[PDB]
């Protein structure tokens, strides 16, 4: 090591991503850090609703007898899939909305159950994030052409053992979707926050942004998207009002001169980056420490 620099200041951070100790004079793009308190905003269309609960129960215990071994693999395993019956065939969801719940019934201390993704294209716990399917079926026995999610038993600071698997089969489509849970008293049809960075799932489109009210009066559709595919706005079917969506942290530009940051171009009227003065320019705001008594 010859010398080091700490990526703590504005100028030092710009040197760390530029991977150089000297930054040539010019204009550099940058992005503010995203907040972490992101609320959840959900918009959905009211349709014929029936809710199915896919509940998986995992329970095991050590073989009771003359040997009180604890680190050994469990000997008795009892895995059930709620209303699953082997002779009836796989448990296929046949309603519009559903949720998946994992119930651990093991009482042994330091022992816990878990489920892995395996070769499936989705995780058992993440299906509740508005995932779309044309059909979905769950079974405790092998399903042809499906995928398997391994079930594991874990000991604290000790190696874990496989205790079975869950078999899932699916097809693409928009008839069945997975919702988190029917809480008694939450209007999941239209519950959004405004003027704050929030995570949204609006009409089956997920992203992070800011929602606001625009006077636009488009008559066609309920969802408006850009060429990139990103959602630019949506319409409330009960109101008639159209809301716009903006990214939380749009890029800015920093002016560097003689290894120092002298100004910044901004899209908002904030004295950002510690500058004490801000001026209004024809197509952006400009913030700097300048006194505007210069000519060169």
């Amino acid at each position, epitope marked *: 090591i010859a010398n080091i620099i700490y990526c703590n200041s504005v100028i030092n951070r710009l040197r760390c991503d530029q991977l150089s100790f000297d930054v040539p004079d010019g204009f550099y793009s940058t992005s503010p850090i995203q907040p972490v*308190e992101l609320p959840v905003s959900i918009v959905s269309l009211p349709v014929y609703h029936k809710h199915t609960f896919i509940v998986l129960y995992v329970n095991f215990e050590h073989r*009771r007898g003359p040997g*009180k071994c*604890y680190n050994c693999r469990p000997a008795v395993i009892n895995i059930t899939l709620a209303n699953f019956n082997e002779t009836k065939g796989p448990l296929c969801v046949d309603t519009s909305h559903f949720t998946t*719940q*994992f*119930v*651990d*019934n*093991v*009482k*042994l*201390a*330091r*022992w*816990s*159950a*878990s489920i892995n993704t395996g070769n499936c294209p989705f995780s*058992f*716990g993440k299906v509740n994030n508005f995932v779309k399917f044309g059909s979905v079926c769950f079974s405790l026995k092998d399903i042809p052409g499906g995928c398997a999610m391994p079930i594991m038993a874990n000991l*604290v600071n000790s190696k874990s053992h496989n205790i079975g698997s869950l078999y899932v089969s699916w097809s693409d489509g928009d008839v069945i979707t997975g919702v988190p849970k029917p809480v008694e008293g939450v209007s999941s049809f239209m519950n959004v926050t405004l003027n704050k960075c929030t995570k949204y799932n609006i009409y089956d489109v997920s992203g992070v942004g800011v929602i606001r009210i625009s006077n636009d009066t488009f008559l066609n559709g309920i969802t408006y998207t850009s060429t990139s595919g990103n959602l630019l706005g949506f319409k409330d079917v009960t109101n008639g009002t159209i809301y716009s969506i903006t990214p939380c942290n749009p890029p800015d530009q920093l002016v560097v001169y003689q290894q120092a940051v002298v100004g910044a171009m901004l899209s908002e009227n904030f004295t950002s980056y510690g500058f004490s003065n801000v001026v209004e320019m024809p197509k952006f705001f400009y913030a700097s420490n300048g006194t505007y008594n210069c000519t060169d």
Partner: antibody
Amino acid sequence: VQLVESGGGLVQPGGSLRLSCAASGFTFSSYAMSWVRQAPGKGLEWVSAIIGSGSNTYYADSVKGRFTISRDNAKNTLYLQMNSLRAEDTAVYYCAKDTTPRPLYSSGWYGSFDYWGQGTPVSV
Amino acid sequence: IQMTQSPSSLSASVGDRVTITCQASQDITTYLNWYQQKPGKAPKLLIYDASNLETGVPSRFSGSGSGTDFTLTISSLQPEDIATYYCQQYDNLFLTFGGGTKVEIK
């Protein structure tokens, strides 16, 4: 793994009290919390418990209906709502930590507490 | 579920093979843990699952039993062993504590 509580004092019967407990030095969301109090000259009486995700809430028979248990995983804080005080709630309260780590997508058993706090008493 | 700790108090000398038992009134199988309670301090975990020694406790403690009667024995009494003891079951979410015992010095 440090636990510290606050909110003790003297409250008239039937009012309200906002107890609190703070946790640090471990992944807070993976462990179920519990609330327990020791009456003067009595043993330990379980008050309430909360799952790591906060989805399931349990209470004792005397605790049931009077108080609500809540937790905030964004700041590693455990909250309790003392409502409808009686004279028998005069005791010291401890917040405990379960020993079994569980995934946030799973509900599970509890009962083997290993680490406790320091104890904030209340009077009524 | 009711649990009884007996005797509520006993005195012993340094080196005695102290033993304490508590009943459960129900088939708890193996779901019990023991606690250490120094007055003026919060409790600490001694043995879980009725037979496992916690990594933070000296190896001079041992417990065993199955069904409804469970036992906790001390190999030999040391000067810091003087403290309140408690058994607690976790076979049900509405868990209960025992009557509590107060060991004493001789």
